[PDB]
């Protein structure tokens, strides 16, 4: 529990056509974070005053 699923890692790609006096880099992955059961994380408070 707390496991992060992914089906594409970080990749890096680039163009030039149909640019215009430019080269440009793209980076795109696929991922998320999931609370499996109900609980097992606790924090605060630690409020305000």
């Amino acid at each position: 529990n707390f496991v992060m699923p992914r089906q594409r890692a970080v990749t890096v790609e680039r163009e030039r056509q149909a640019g215009k006096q430019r080269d440009a880099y793209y980076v795109t992955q696929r991922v998320n974070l999931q609370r499996y059961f109900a609980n097992g994380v606790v924090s605060g408070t630690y409020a305000a005053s």
């Binding site: 640019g19 215009k20 006096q21 430019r22």
Partner: protein, 50 residues
């Protein structure tokens, strides 16, 4: 017969791509020139008895 070209507008020194703000040069039309050949003629005669 083609025509001259052209004028290109220089950039504003800050606009280096997206977008370049240079001229749009319109594709020069090839102009036809056609030639027309006119005719003339003359005739003459004499009779064999003259």
């Amino acid at each position: 017969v083609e025509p001259d070209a052209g004028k290109a507008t220089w950039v504003a020194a800050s606009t280096y791509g997206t977008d370049t703000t240079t001229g749009e040069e319109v594709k020069g039309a090839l102009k036809e020139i056609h030639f027309s050949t006119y005719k003339l003629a003359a005739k003459s005669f004499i009779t064999d008895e003259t």
